C-alpha cells in the first residue's frame, strides 16, 4: 500500500503599490476621559487584553502592502 504525495505550489505574485506624493496629513485628537472599575481579574492560556486605553495612532506607510501565506501539510497513519 504505497503512498506518494507531491506538494509543488508555485507563486509568482506581486503585491505592488505606486504613489506619487503622500502627505499633508493632520491627526489632532481632542482628549478624553476613561474610567474602569473592576474587583477581580483572572486570565489564562494566551489571553490578549487591553483595559482602559486612550490611544492615538498615526500610521502612514509609503507602501503598506502585506502578504500572508500559510502552507500546512499534515499526514496521519
Residue numbers in the entry: 304 to 380
What did the study's authors say about this model?
Dominantly inherited mutations in MAPT, the microtubule-associated protein tau gene, give rise to cases of FTD and parkinsonism linked to chromosome 17. Both amino acid substitutions gave rise to tau filaments with the Alzheimer fold, which consisted of paired helical filaments in all V337M and R406W cases and of straight filaments in two V337M cases. V337 lies inside the ordered core of the Alzheimer fold, whereas R406 lies outside it.
PHFs from the cases with substitution V337M were nearly identical to those of PHFs assembled from wild-type tau in AD. In the PHF map of V337M (EMD-19846), the density for the side chain of residue 337 was 50% wider than that of residue V339, when viewed perpendicularly to the filament axis, consistent with it being occupied by a mixture of wild-type (V337) and mutant (M337) residues. Using MS, we found both wild-type and mutant tau in the core of filaments extracted from the frontal cortex of three individuals with substitution V337M, indicating that the Alzheimer tau fold can accommodate V337 and M337. Immunoblotting of sarkosyl-insoluble tau revealed strong bands of 60, 64 and 68 kDa, as well as a weaker band of 72 kDa, indicating the presence of all six tau isoforms in a hyperphosphorylated state. Small variations among the observed structures of filaments with the V337M substitution revealed the presence of an adaptable region around the mutation site that explains the accommodation of the mutant methionine without disruption of the overall fold.
